[PDB]
Amino acid sequence: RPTLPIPDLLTTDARNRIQLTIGAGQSTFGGKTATTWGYNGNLLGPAVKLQRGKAVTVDIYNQLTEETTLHWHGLEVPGEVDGGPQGIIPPGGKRSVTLNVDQPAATCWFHPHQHGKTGRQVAMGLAGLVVIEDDEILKLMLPKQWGIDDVPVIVQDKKFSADGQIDYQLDVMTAAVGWFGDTLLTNGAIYPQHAAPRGWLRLRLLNGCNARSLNFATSDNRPLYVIASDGGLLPEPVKVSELPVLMGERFEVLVEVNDNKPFDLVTLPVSQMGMAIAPFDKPHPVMRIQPIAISASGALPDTLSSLPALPSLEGLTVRKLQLSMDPMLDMMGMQMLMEKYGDQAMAGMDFHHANKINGQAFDMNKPMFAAAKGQYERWVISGVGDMMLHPFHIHGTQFRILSENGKPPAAHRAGWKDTVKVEGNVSEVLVKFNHDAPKEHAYMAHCHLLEHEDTGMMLGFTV
Ligand SMILES: [Ca+2]
Ligand SMILES: [Cu+2]
Ligand SMILES: [Cu+2]
Ligand SMILES: [Cu+2]
């Protein structure tokens, strides 16, 4: 197996700047070359390293031949630098943003947010990571050797055509159920191996799929100890044997590594339309962990951080967000899925403006409301009325889940999150926006099943 590719850990240079170049290149998958897009390279991107309380300026050079944007997913930053669909970078052009990091340590990420084309641009290869550090986390003595015992794991599926090229399409079927493929990539590689020292191995997991939810486990059922979610550390580790991860979510886990026993990280079949078609009808390897018989230094702390109480709900503004899909899209898309793949597509269970929030397909020129600045609000998001999975992402914040799809959140999902599951039921989150977003650079709230976002399931809001 190839070694697990490790994204470069990109820190500020001598001028306090970071340079990112967006461009087209080539990669090889299964011995066949494909055109791919990357940040500072051919595919995917680096891990931008930030410190809480320190400003960095990022210079972003778009060397593609089409318009793009760069969204810092999970970052609590003003709308002007949030990189939603209004954050246009012309082809051949450059935009610079200053990030004033004002949140605790976390693994965030970055990716395009081009109006109507986010799915395609992510599918072509664009995604990178953000590693935010603070004083608190560094005192913990967690595994911290990047690319050795502290490793990012960006898991993505792709569909390829017979010629080896990426086969992306936004059509009636994918507008309904998402773009998904039969090939799983781990930091861009097919089933790579990672050599890790004996002791604890820290994995920063990102589901970077357009539409496919994942469920991580190990091949011998050794536990995963969840230490962090989208917005940073949990108060204490949460031991799990399976870890569902929705599109765009991150979790950091520690797993034990010992000398005479290699094992795989795997993903288990999920109950989501289209996602259990072979080879995903069975557990699927993600990467092989190869023990190297030298002792690692990292620890699993009993206590990771302090998690504040949920604030009082009394008197908070409640905003209702009803997700919906045009019944015609729902029917036609499901029918196309069934016709192509048959019953296995349901195991365990103009389209361009057919997905909606509050009866409205995304209109970039009309923010749906103004949210308060510096005040907790209660947002209620419903997927009642269809059977699709909607991981709902709200920009400009890290929130607390009060209820997730009609149930209290699982312990490892009860900390800081920027995504919440919505699937045929109702979720409620406690959100606060500390930064401005004017109408010209509004925050987005949207489904992170990218083809839903691209066909209308998004709203803009100002702060
Ligand atoms: Ca202990
Ligand atoms: Cu995102
Ligand atoms: Cu959706
Ligand atoms: Cu977004």
Side-chain angles (χ1 to χ4, degrees):
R1 306 313 307 161
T3 61
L4 175 74
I6 304 300
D8 292 333
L9 192 57
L10 180 56
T11 65
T12 66
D13 57 18
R15 307 171 312 277
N16 204 31
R17 306 178 88 87
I18 289 185
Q19 183 178 288
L20 292 175
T21 298
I22 318 178
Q26 288 191 142
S27 302
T28 302
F29 308 101
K32 291 185 177 179
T33 307
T35 295
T36 55
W37 295 356
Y39 298 111
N40 290 0
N42 292 296
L43 178 63
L44 288 170
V48 172
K49 187 170 183 171
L50 306 178
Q51 300 173 357
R52 186 182 189 157
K54 315 297 172 301
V56 52
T57 300
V58 186
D59 299 317
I60 310 162
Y61 296 87
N62 181 13
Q63 296 190 344
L64 304 169
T65 59
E66 69 181 78
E67 194 174 74
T68 192
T69 81
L70 197 156
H71 169 57
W72 306 93
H73 184 136
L75 292 204
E76 298 166 22
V77 294
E80 287 179 352
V81 302
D82 181 57
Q86 292 161 305
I88 290 323
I89 314 177
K94 174 210 180 187
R95 291 294 183 273
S96 298
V97 296
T98 295
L99 306 181
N100 292 289
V101 195
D102 186 40
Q103 68 195 88
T107 304
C108 293
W109 68 299
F110 65 93
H111 63 78
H113 226 298
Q114 181 67 15
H115 189 20
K117 303 186 169 71
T118 295
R120 182 168 177 267
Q121 301 197 340
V122 174
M124 288 302 298
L126 295 182
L129 293 170
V130 181
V131 172
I132 305 173
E133 303 220 322
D134 61 19
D135 294 340
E136 194 273 342
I137 197 159
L138 294 181
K139 302 184 188 308
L140 298 179
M141 313 273 77
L142 288 169
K144 60 174 179 180
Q145 310 189 22
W146 186 258
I148 299 174
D149 62 2
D150 177 12
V151 152
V153 185
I154 303 167
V155 184
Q156 304 179 293
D157 63 333
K158 294 194 196 300
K159 173 189 311 217
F160 296 93
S161 43
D163 63 6
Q165 300 297 323
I166 297 167
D167 183 18
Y168 183 80
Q169 55 284 130
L170 181 58
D171 59 26
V172 179
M173 190 187 80
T174 68
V177 304
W179 186 75
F180 62 90
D182 63 355
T183 303
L184 199 68
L185 305 176
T186 311
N187 295 351
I190 298 176
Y191 193 14
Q193 60 174 315
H194 180 69
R198 178 199 308 139
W200 291 112
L201 170 60
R202 176 180 185 182
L203 304 180
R204 305 181 188 237
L205 301 166
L206 164 64
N207 182 346
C209 298
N210 281 37
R212 174 182 297 283
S213 63
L214 300 169
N215 184 9
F216 295 105
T218 63
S219 58
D220 58 7
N221 206 33
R222 73 183 66 192
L224 301 176
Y225 294 86
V226 188
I227 64 161
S229 52
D230 307 325
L233 296 166
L234 300 179
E236 65 181 6
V238 177
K239 183 186 179 180
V240 305
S241 70
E242 307 188 3
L243 178 59
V245 185
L246 308 178
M247 300 80 84
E249 293 191 325
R250 290 85 61 210
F251 288 96
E252 305 181 40
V253 301
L254 262 63
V255 62
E256 180 179 349
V257 177
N258 44 27
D259 294 350
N260 201 260
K261 195 154 171 45
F263 65 98
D264 286 347
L265 180 70
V266 307
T267 179
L268 305 178
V270 301
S271 291
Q272 182 189 347
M273 284 185 41
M275 305 304 164
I277 299 162
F280 296 100
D281 60 320
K282 301 173 190 304
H284 196 298
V286 174
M287 82 175 186
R288 175 94 67 188
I289 291 85
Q290 187 67 38
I292 51 193
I294 72 148
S295 296
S297 168
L300 176 71
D302 290 342
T303 306
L304 298 164
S305 64
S306 182
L307 182 67
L310 298 181
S312 171
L313 302 182
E314 197 275 337
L316 302 182
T317 299
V318 177
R319 304 193 190 279
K320 302 184 300 295
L321 297 193
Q322 177 68 65
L323 309 181
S324 69
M325 310 181 60
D326 187 311
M328 276 298 299
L329 173 57
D330 205 340
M331 177 197 314
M332 289 184 52
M334 290 190 306
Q335 186 175 281
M336 291 182 174
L337 185 69
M338 297 314 295
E339 289 180 354
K340 182 162 187 183
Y341 298 105
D343 295 330
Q344 189 62 22
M346 295 303 192
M349 304 303 296
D350 194 345
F351 62 85
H352 290 99
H353 306 288
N355 285 310
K356 299 174 185 176
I357 307 187
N358 293 341
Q360 177 167 336
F362 180 61
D363 188 337
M364 196 163 71
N365 296 317
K366 336 279 166 46
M368 190 171 296
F369 55 82
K373 184 180 179 179
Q375 301 257 11
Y376 273 113
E377 299 187 339
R378 186 148 59 90
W379 290 23
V380 178
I381 308 104
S382 173
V384 175
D386 64 73
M387 301 176 63
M388 307 307 191
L389 171 66
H390 314 283
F392 198 75
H393 172 54
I394 303 166
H395 293 205
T397 190
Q398 287 293 335
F399 56 69
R400 307 288 306 277
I401 299 172
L402 175 55
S403 171
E404 184 155 43
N405 212 39
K407 304 176 178 181
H412 65 282
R413 303 179 63 83
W416 298 107
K417 305 275 287 95
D418 59 45
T419 305
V420 61
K421 182 182 178 176
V422 180
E423 182 192 324
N425 208 311
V426 181
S427 297
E428 205 161 282
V429 302
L430 207 21
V431 287
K432 180 160 70 69
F433 304 101
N434 298 319
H435 313 274
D436 300 320
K439 65 181 181 297
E440 294 79 13
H441 295 284
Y443 286 139
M444 300 293 118
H446 60 96
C447 179
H448 215 284
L449 192 161
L450 300 181
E451 288 64 45
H452 286 182
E453 172 191 332
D454 282 339
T455 57
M457 198 174 290
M458 176 154 70
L459 62 80
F461 67 99
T462 60
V463 174

